[PDB]
Design a protein around this ligand. Structure first.
Ligand code: AFJ
Length: 370
């Protein structure tokens, strides 16, 4: 069953997690980044300095041209290309073949990463944010429509090269401990959720909770950092600075530009606070929390680190540094996202990442931004 899909992801820290796929007939093998923050399936289809291989449409007998161009901008990076369809498989996934939409990337800017080892992107979010428009059926919708694969998938992203699992069509219980806690998908475009409270080392940030979700909060496996709205970012950095005031850092560290180092084995983990994000729950006035350790938001790059919390102008993004602590279930069928402590969690001496509940939280709907 699902055991065949365990450990089917690889990657390099800060460079994304990818799964192996094949496109075309005969099968062309490519590594494809798993991106829950977008909805287009696209692959390099022309030579590029950072590509070791790419998709060759002329060598595939099942390729069909859709005679339509396409462009996709991301927070950082963008590409343009030609739309078409072809047959697609996932060797370490379910045993099926689907005809899916594919954008053949012909030109790009700051999209491909040198040394990343992936040549394409699998947008796993909903058609609502697909380009050129929502009539271009995303890959997972095609998968579910053409096969018996159930309408959900789950991601276990493991940090300190790295690996993980994408379980397509279900949940593998060997991959997490404790209970799964679910938060509603507020609207099916991004995987949008609602954050209802934030605490740092047990102290409430005490902001209007709308600020936490201004102008949206999303879960994105294709973003490295925890990215926070301007006002929230400032409050969070202020609190984290105060907790670590014992030591002194370059001011470019807090902007993610400069790294800090310590002698191997002497990283003062203790002076950096835990961060708790409370998410809206499944019953009235009920929430739960996920707690993040400094080992997650200080990304290893003697031991040197970069600050992996950064400022956003497009809402909160819960990226890899959040997901790495957890097993995350994208339960599209029941419009909810589940969190549990991952089997591959990192080890702090006196502290542990957690998913805990129930909590009572009043007026949660008012935390959503309009
Ligand atoms: C068309 C409408 C949908 C657009 N969606 C997005 O822009 C989502 C929010 C972001 C998307 O996941 C892209 C993926 C990347 C591979 C280009 N990520 C980024 O732009 C982010 C920008 C971070 S700003 C410090 N890139 C990274 O974190 C670097 C690591 C990645 C190579 C894994």
């Amino acid at each position: 069953s699902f055991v065949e899909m365990v450990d089917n992801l690889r990657g390099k820290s800060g460079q994304g997690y990818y799964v192996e796929m094949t496109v075309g007939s005969p099968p062309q093998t490519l590594n494809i980044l798993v991106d829950t923050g977008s909805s287009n399936f696209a692959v390099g289809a022309a030579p590029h300095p950072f590509l070791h291989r790419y998709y060759q449409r002329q060598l595939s007998s099942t390729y069909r041209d859709l005679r339509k161009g396409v462009y996709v901008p991301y927070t950082q990076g963008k590409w343009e290309g030609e739309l078409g369809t072809d047959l697609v498989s996932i060797p370490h996934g379910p045993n099926v073949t689907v005809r899916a939409n594919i954008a053949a990337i012909t030109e790009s800017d700051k999209f491909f990463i040198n040394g990343s080892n992936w040549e394409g992107i699998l947008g796993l979010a909903y058609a609502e944010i697909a380009r050129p428009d929502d009539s271009l059926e995303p890959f997972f919708d095609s998968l579910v429509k053409q096969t018996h694969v159930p309408n959900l998938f789950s991601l276990q992203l493991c940090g300190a090269s790295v690996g993980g699992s994408m379980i397509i069509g279900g949940i593998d219980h060997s991959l997490y401990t404790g209970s799964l806690w679910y938060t509603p998908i507020r609207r099916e475009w991004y995987y949008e959720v609602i954050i209802v409270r934030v605490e740092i080392n047990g102290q409430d940030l005490k902001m209007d909770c709308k600020e936490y979700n201004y102008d949206k909060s999303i879960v994105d496996s294709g973003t490295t950092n925890l990215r926070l709205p301007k006002k929230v970012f400032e409050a969070a950095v202020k609190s984290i600075k105060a907790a670590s005031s014992t030591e002194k850092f370059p001011d470019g560290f807090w902007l993610g530009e400069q790294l800090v180092c310590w002698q191997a084995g002497t990283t003062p983990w203790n002076i950096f606070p835990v961060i708790s994000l409370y998410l809206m729950g499944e019953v009235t006035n009920q929430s739960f929390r996920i707690t993040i350790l400094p080992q997650q938001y200080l990304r290893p790059v003697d031991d040197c680190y970069k600050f992996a919390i950064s400022q956003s102008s497009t809402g909160t993004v819960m990226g890899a540094v959040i997901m790495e602590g957890f097993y995350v279930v994208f339960d599209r069928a029941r419009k909810r996202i589940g969190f549990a402590v991952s089997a591959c969690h990192v080890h702090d001496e006196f502290r542990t990442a957690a998913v805990e509940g129930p909590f009572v939280t009043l007026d949660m709907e008012d935390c959503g931004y309009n």
